[PDB]
Amino acid sequence: LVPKLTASVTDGAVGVTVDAPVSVTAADGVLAAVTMVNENGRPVAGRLSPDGLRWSTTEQLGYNRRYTLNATALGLGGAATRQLTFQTSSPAHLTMPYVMPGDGEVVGVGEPVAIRFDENIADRGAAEKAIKITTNPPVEGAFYWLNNREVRWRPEHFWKPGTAVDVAVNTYGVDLGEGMFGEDNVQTHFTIGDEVIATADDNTKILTVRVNGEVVKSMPTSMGKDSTPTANGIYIVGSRYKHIIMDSSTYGVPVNSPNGYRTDVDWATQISYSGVFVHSAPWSVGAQGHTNTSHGCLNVSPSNAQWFYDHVKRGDIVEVVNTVGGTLPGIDGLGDWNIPWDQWRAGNAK
Protein backbone atom coordinates (compact mmCIF):
# COMPACT_ATOMS: atom_id res chain seq x y z
CA LEU A 1 0.00 0.00 0.00
CA VAL A 2 1.31 3.39 -1.14
CA PRO A 3 0.98 6.56 1.00
CA LYS A 4 -2.30 8.43 0.49
CA LEU A 5 -2.51 12.24 0.56
CA THR A 6 -5.73 13.97 1.59
CA ALA A 7 -6.24 17.75 1.75
CA SER A 8 -8.97 19.99 3.16
CA VAL A 9 -9.16 21.60 -0.30
CA THR A 10 -9.11 20.06 -3.78
CA ASP A 11 -7.24 20.72 -6.96
CA GLY A 12 -9.06 23.20 -9.15
CA ALA A 13 -11.28 24.50 -6.38
CA VAL A 14 -12.45 28.13 -6.48
CA GLY A 15 -14.11 30.32 -3.88
CA VAL A 16 -12.22 28.61 -1.10
CA THR A 17 -13.08 30.53 2.03
CA VAL A 18 -10.18 31.67 4.18
CA ASP A 19 -11.98 31.47 7.54
CA ALA A 20 -10.22 28.12 8.07
CA PRO A 21 -6.67 26.81 7.93
CA VAL A 22 -5.74 24.49 5.06
CA SER A 23 -4.55 21.02 5.97
CA VAL A 24 -2.89 17.95 4.44
CA THR A 25 -2.97 14.40 5.82
CA ALA A 26 -1.01 11.25 5.10
CA ALA A 27 -2.23 7.68 5.37
CA ASP A 28 0.00 4.59 5.06
CA GLY A 29 3.01 6.85 5.12
CA VAL A 30 4.38 10.03 6.60
CA LEU A 31 4.68 13.52 5.14
CA ALA A 32 8.21 14.25 4.02
CA ALA A 33 7.70 17.85 2.98
CA VAL A 34 4.75 20.11 2.42
CA THR A 35 4.85 23.61 0.97
CA MET A 36 2.29 26.18 -0.03
CA VAL A 37 3.09 29.36 -1.97
CA ASN A 38 0.96 32.12 -3.54
CA GLU A 39 1.22 33.16 -7.23
CA ASN A 40 4.05 35.55 -6.42
CA GLY A 41 5.83 32.57 -4.83
CA ARG A 42 5.53 33.99 -1.29
CA PRO A 43 5.51 31.01 1.13
CA VAL A 44 2.64 30.42 3.49
CA ALA A 45 3.79 29.43 6.98
CA GLY A 46 2.84 25.92 7.97
CA ARG A 47 3.42 23.29 10.64
CA LEU A 48 3.96 19.54 10.50
CA SER A 49 2.83 17.42 13.46
CA PRO A 50 5.45 15.47 15.47
CA ASP A 51 4.14 12.10 14.20
CA GLY A 52 4.57 13.32 10.61
CA LEU A 53 0.95 12.70 9.64
CA ARG A 54 -0.66 16.16 9.54
CA TRP A 55 0.27 19.56 8.19
CA SER A 56 -1.68 22.80 8.56
CA THR A 57 -1.32 26.43 7.57
CA THR A 58 -0.50 28.49 10.68
CA GLU A 59 -0.98 31.89 9.10
CA GLN A 60 -4.01 33.76 7.76
CA LEU A 61 -4.74 33.15 4.06
CA GLY A 62 -5.46 36.09 1.78
CA TYR A 63 -8.52 37.04 -0.21
CA ASN A 64 -8.31 36.85 -4.00
CA ARG A 65 -5.22 34.61 -4.14
CA ARG A 66 -4.19 31.49 -6.05
CA TYR A 67 -2.31 29.07 -3.75
CA THR A 68 -0.21 26.06 -4.75
CA LEU A 69 0.23 23.12 -2.40
CA ASN A 70 3.06 20.61 -2.88
CA ALA A 71 3.27 17.55 -0.64
CA THR A 72 5.37 14.41 -0.49
CA ALA A 73 4.60 11.27 1.46
CA LEU A 74 6.82 8.24 2.11
CA GLY A 75 5.85 4.82 3.34
CA LEU A 76 6.95 1.19 3.32
CA GLY A 77 4.74 0.89 0.23
CA GLY A 78 6.80 3.51 -1.64
CA ALA A 79 6.27 7.25 -2.19
CA ALA A 80 3.52 9.65 -3.33
CA THR A 81 3.29 13.26 -4.49
CA ARG A 82 0.45 15.67 -5.14
CA GLN A 83 0.30 19.17 -6.44
CA LEU A 84 -2.88 21.19 -5.75
CA THR A 85 -3.82 24.66 -6.89
CA PHE A 86 -6.88 26.43 -5.48
CA GLN A 87 -8.33 29.91 -5.61
CA THR A 88 -9.69 31.79 -2.58
CA SER A 89 -12.75 34.05 -2.24
CA SER A 90 -12.65 37.31 -4.13
CA PRO A 91 -14.90 39.76 -2.28
CA ALA A 92 -16.78 42.58 -4.02
CA HIS A 93 -16.80 44.37 -0.66
CA LEU A 94 -15.12 44.30 2.72
CA THR A 95 -16.88 45.11 5.97
CA MET A 96 -15.23 45.77 9.32
CA PRO A 97 -16.92 44.98 12.67
CA TYR A 98 -16.66 47.07 15.83
CA VAL A 99 -17.59 45.40 19.09
CA MET A 100 -18.82 46.91 22.37
CA PRO A 101 -18.52 47.13 25.28
CA GLY A 102 -14.77 47.70 25.41
CA ASP A 103 -12.41 44.87 26.26
CA GLY A 104 -11.61 44.19 29.92
CA GLU A 105 -14.36 46.63 31.01
CA VAL A 106 -16.75 46.08 33.93
CA VAL A 107 -20.29 47.05 33.03
CA GLY A 108 -23.82 47.11 34.43
CA VAL A 109 -26.48 44.42 34.32
CA GLY A 110 -28.27 45.92 31.30
CA GLU A 111 -25.33 46.04 28.93
CA PRO A 112 -25.99 44.25 25.64
CA VAL A 113 -23.32 42.79 23.38
CA ALA A 114 -23.11 44.99 20.32
CA ILE A 115 -21.57 44.34 16.91
CA ARG A 116 -21.64 47.25 14.48
CA PHE A 117 -20.55 46.82 10.87
CA ASP A 118 -19.38 49.69 8.69
CA GLU A 119 -21.48 48.37 5.80
CA ASN A 120 -25.00 47.02 5.29
CA ILE A 121 -25.23 43.31 5.97
CA ALA A 122 -27.26 41.51 3.31
CA ASP A 123 -27.10 38.10 5.03
CA ARG A 124 -27.77 38.70 8.74
CA GLY A 125 -27.89 34.97 9.43
CA ALA A 126 -24.28 34.52 8.33
CA ALA A 127 -23.15 37.40 10.49
CA GLU A 128 -25.02 35.90 13.51
CA LYS A 129 -23.45 32.50 12.89
CA ALA A 130 -19.87 33.89 12.89
CA ILE A 131 -20.40 35.60 16.24
CA LYS A 132 -19.69 33.29 19.17
CA ILE A 133 -20.82 34.47 22.62
CA THR A 134 -19.47 32.69 25.72
CA THR A 135 -21.00 33.32 29.16
CA ASN A 136 -19.89 32.30 32.64
CA PRO A 137 -22.10 31.36 34.38
CA PRO A 138 -23.77 30.25 31.16
CA VAL A 139 -27.05 31.90 30.30
CA GLU A 140 -29.13 31.81 27.16
CA GLY A 141 -29.35 34.83 24.85
CA ALA A 142 -30.21 35.87 21.28
CA PHE A 143 -29.44 38.25 18.38
CA TYR A 144 -31.61 41.14 17.22
CA TRP A 145 -30.86 43.85 14.66
CA LEU A 146 -31.45 47.55 15.50
CA ASN A 147 -30.68 48.55 11.92
CA ASN A 148 -28.99 47.20 8.77
CA ARG A 149 -25.52 47.55 10.33
CA GLU A 150 -25.78 46.72 14.02
CA VAL A 151 -26.75 43.49 15.76
CA ARG A 152 -27.28 43.19 19.55
CA TRP A 153 -27.17 40.16 21.85
CA ARG A 154 -28.63 39.80 25.34
CA PRO A 155 -30.21 37.42 27.87
CA GLU A 156 -33.96 37.37 28.55
CA HIS A 157 -33.38 39.14 31.87
CA PHE A 158 -30.70 41.52 33.15
CA TRP A 159 -27.33 39.83 33.65
CA LYS A 160 -26.53 38.33 37.02
CA PRO A 161 -23.51 40.23 38.39
CA GLY A 162 -20.14 38.47 38.37
CA THR A 163 -20.75 37.05 34.89
CA ALA A 164 -17.88 36.71 32.39
CA VAL A 165 -18.78 37.42 28.76
CA ASP A 166 -16.58 36.52 25.78
CA VAL A 167 -17.36 37.89 22.30
CA ALA A 168 -15.58 36.31 19.28
CA VAL A 169 -16.44 38.11 16.03
CA ASN A 170 -15.01 35.76 13.41
CA THR A 171 -16.15 37.35 10.17
CA TYR A 172 -12.88 37.14 8.31
CA GLY A 173 -13.44 34.75 5.41
CA VAL A 174 -17.18 34.77 5.92
CA ASP A 175 -19.57 35.65 3.13
CA LEU A 176 -22.04 38.16 4.63
CA GLY A 177 -23.92 38.20 1.34
CA GLU A 178 -23.93 40.02 -1.99
CA GLY A 179 -20.18 39.44 -2.18
CA MET A 180 -19.41 41.23 1.04
CA PHE A 181 -16.80 39.56 3.27
CA GLY A 182 -15.39 40.34 6.71
CA GLU A 183 -12.26 42.46 6.67
CA ASP A 184 -11.15 41.06 10.03
CA ASN A 185 -11.95 39.35 13.31
CA VAL A 186 -12.45 41.18 16.59
CA GLN A 187 -12.56 39.82 20.10
CA THR A 188 -13.74 41.50 23.29
CA HIS A 189 -14.14 40.18 26.86
CA PHE A 190 -16.00 41.99 29.66
CA THR A 191 -17.39 41.41 33.14
CA ILE A 192 -20.79 42.30 34.67
CA GLY A 193 -20.47 44.58 37.71
CA ASP A 194 -22.91 45.50 40.48
CA GLU A 195 -26.64 45.63 39.88
CA VAL A 196 -27.55 49.30 39.67
CA ILE A 197 -31.11 50.23 38.86
CA ALA A 198 -32.45 53.77 39.08
CA THR A 199 -36.20 54.26 38.94
CA ALA A 200 -37.74 57.58 37.90
CA ASP A 201 -41.43 57.70 38.92
CA ASP A 202 -43.44 60.56 37.46
CA ASN A 203 -46.16 60.27 40.15
CA THR A 204 -43.63 61.14 42.88
CA LYS A 205 -41.07 62.94 40.71
CA ILE A 206 -38.21 61.08 42.41
CA LEU A 207 -35.29 59.30 40.75
CA THR A 208 -34.40 56.48 43.16
CA VAL A 209 -31.09 54.66 42.75
CA ARG A 210 -30.86 51.04 43.97
CA VAL A 211 -27.52 49.24 44.26
CA ASN A 212 -27.89 45.48 44.68
CA GLY A 213 -31.45 46.02 45.88
CA GLU A 214 -30.67 48.73 48.48
CA VAL A 215 -31.79 52.33 48.07
CA VAL A 216 -28.70 54.53 48.26
CA LYS A 217 -29.84 57.83 46.75
CA SER A 218 -33.13 59.63 46.32
CA MET A 219 -33.13 62.50 43.86
CA PRO A 220 -35.89 65.00 43.26
CA THR A 221 -36.19 65.28 39.50
CA SER A 222 -37.86 67.43 36.84
CA MET A 223 -38.61 65.49 33.67
CA GLY A 224 -40.08 66.49 30.32
CA LYS A 225 -43.02 68.89 30.20
CA ASP A 226 -46.28 67.54 28.77
CA SER A 227 -45.63 68.90 25.26
CA THR A 228 -42.19 67.22 25.22
CA PRO A 229 -42.54 64.32 27.71
CA THR A 230 -39.98 61.70 28.81
CA ALA A 231 -40.81 58.28 27.40
CA ASN A 232 -41.62 55.56 29.89
CA GLY A 233 -39.60 52.40 29.74
CA ILE A 234 -36.17 50.96 30.30
CA TYR A 235 -33.08 52.98 29.48
CA ILE A 236 -29.53 51.65 29.37
CA VAL A 237 -26.80 53.91 30.76
CA GLY A 238 -24.36 54.88 28.00
CA SER A 239 -21.59 57.48 28.05
CA ARG A 240 -20.76 59.95 30.82
CA TYR A 241 -19.69 63.60 30.60
CA LYS A 242 -18.30 66.10 33.10
CA HIS A 243 -19.82 68.72 30.83
CA ILE A 244 -21.38 68.70 27.37
CA ILE A 245 -23.20 70.94 24.91
CA MET A 246 -26.58 69.43 24.15
CA ASP A 247 -27.69 70.29 20.66
CA SER A 248 -31.28 69.44 19.72
CA SER A 249 -30.27 69.13 16.05
CA THR A 250 -28.05 66.15 16.94
CA TYR A 251 -31.35 64.34 17.60
CA GLY A 252 -33.25 65.77 14.66
CA VAL A 253 -34.87 68.86 16.15
CA PRO A 254 -33.66 72.12 14.55
CA VAL A 255 -32.19 74.35 17.30
CA ASN A 256 -34.17 77.16 15.74
CA SER A 257 -37.56 75.39 16.10
CA PRO A 258 -39.91 75.60 19.14
CA ASN A 259 -38.67 72.40 20.78
CA GLY A 260 -35.11 73.15 19.74
CA TYR A 261 -32.38 73.95 22.23
CA ARG A 262 -28.66 74.23 22.65
CA THR A 263 -27.60 73.94 26.26
CA ASP A 264 -24.25 73.66 27.96
CA VAL A 265 -24.82 71.29 30.91
CA ASP A 266 -22.75 69.63 33.63
CA TRP A 267 -22.50 66.05 34.86
CA ALA A 268 -24.56 64.44 32.15
CA THR A 269 -25.22 60.73 31.71
CA GLN A 270 -26.75 59.70 28.39
CA ILE A 271 -29.52 57.10 28.70
CA SER A 272 -30.92 57.19 25.13
CA TYR A 273 -29.64 58.01 21.63
CA SER A 274 -32.83 60.03 21.31
CA GLY A 275 -31.16 62.57 23.58
CA VAL A 276 -32.28 61.76 27.10
CA PHE A 277 -29.71 62.51 29.79
CA VAL A 278 -29.64 62.65 33.54
CA HIS A 279 -27.92 66.01 34.00
CA SER A 280 -27.37 68.90 36.37
CA ALA A 281 -30.03 71.58 36.14
CA PRO A 282 -29.61 74.39 38.73
CA TRP A 283 -32.18 76.47 36.84
CA SER A 284 -35.02 74.13 37.83
CA VAL A 285 -34.24 73.02 41.42
CA GLY A 286 -37.48 74.67 42.54
CA ALA A 287 -39.37 72.54 40.02
CA GLN A 288 -37.55 69.31 40.87
CA GLY A 289 -39.74 67.01 42.95
CA HIS A 290 -42.82 68.95 41.83
CA THR A 291 -43.17 69.96 38.16
CA ASN A 292 -41.91 68.62 34.83
CA THR A 293 -40.06 71.36 32.90
CA SER A 294 -37.44 69.82 30.59
CA HIS A 295 -37.35 68.94 26.86
CA GLY A 296 -37.03 65.31 27.95
CA CYS A 297 -33.98 64.97 30.18
CA LEU A 298 -34.03 64.00 33.83
CA ASN A 299 -33.19 67.25 35.60
CA VAL A 300 -31.49 66.89 38.98
CA SER A 301 -29.56 69.14 41.36
CA PRO A 302 -25.86 69.65 40.62
CA SER A 303 -24.69 67.48 43.51
CA ASN A 304 -27.14 64.70 42.60
CA ALA A 305 -26.08 64.79 38.90
CA GLN A 306 -22.42 64.50 39.92
CA TRP A 307 -23.33 61.71 42.31
CA PHE A 308 -24.93 59.92 39.36
CA TYR A 309 -21.85 60.46 37.17
CA ASP A 310 -19.61 58.99 39.86
CA HIS A 311 -21.65 55.98 40.91
CA VAL A 312 -23.43 54.96 37.75
CA LYS A 313 -21.49 53.12 35.00
CA ARG A 314 -22.14 52.08 31.39
CA GLY A 315 -24.81 49.36 31.35
CA ASP A 316 -26.62 50.26 34.56
CA ILE A 317 -30.39 50.71 34.23
CA VAL A 318 -32.72 53.67 34.42
CA GLU A 319 -36.47 52.93 34.43
CA VAL A 320 -39.02 55.62 33.75
CA VAL A 321 -42.62 55.02 34.86
CA ASN A 322 -45.93 56.87 34.78
CA THR A 323 -45.09 59.79 32.49
CA VAL A 324 -47.54 61.04 29.90
CA GLY A 325 -45.13 59.93 27.19
CA GLY A 326 -45.22 56.74 25.17
CA THR A 327 -42.60 54.03 25.46
CA LEU A 328 -38.96 54.26 24.52
CA PRO A 329 -38.44 52.62 21.09
CA GLY A 330 -36.62 49.30 21.38
CA ILE A 331 -34.39 50.10 18.42
CA ASP A 332 -33.29 53.38 20.00
CA GLY A 333 -29.69 52.33 20.63
CA LEU A 334 -30.15 52.19 24.40
CA GLY A 335 -33.75 50.94 24.55
CA ASP A 336 -33.18 47.23 23.82
CA TRP A 337 -34.93 45.97 26.92
CA ASN A 338 -38.24 47.54 25.83
CA ILE A 339 -38.62 44.81 23.22
CA PRO A 340 -40.54 41.73 24.41
CA TRP A 341 -38.32 38.63 24.80
CA ASP A 342 -40.49 36.53 22.47
CA GLN A 343 -40.01 39.17 19.80
CA TRP A 344 -36.26 39.55 20.56
CA ARG A 345 -35.62 35.81 20.65
CA ALA A 346 -37.48 35.33 17.35
CA GLY A 347 -34.81 37.68 15.98
CA ASN A 348 -35.00 39.46 12.62
CA ALA A 349 -32.19 37.86 10.59
CA LYS A 350 -34.70 37.73 7.69
Author numbering: 58 to 407
Per the authors:
The final step of PG biosynthesis in Mtb is catalyzed by two different classes of enzymes, namely the D,D-transpeptidases (also known as Penicillin Binding Proteins – PBPs) and L,D-transpeptidases (Ldts). Approximately two-thirds of the linkages in Mtb PG are of 3 → 3 type and their synthesis is catalyzed by the Ldts, highlighting the importance of these non-classical transpeptidases to this pathogen.
apo and enzyme reacted with biapenem or tebipenem, and collected X-ray diffraction data at 2.49, 2.18 and 2.45 Å resolutions, respectively. All crystal forms belong to the monoclinic P21 space group with similar cell dimensions and contain two molecules per asymmetric unit. The apo and holo structures show negligible differences among them. The observed densities are larger than the glycerol molecule observed in the apo-LdtMt2 crystal form but smaller than expected for an intact biapenem or tebipenem adduct as illustrated in Fig. 1d.
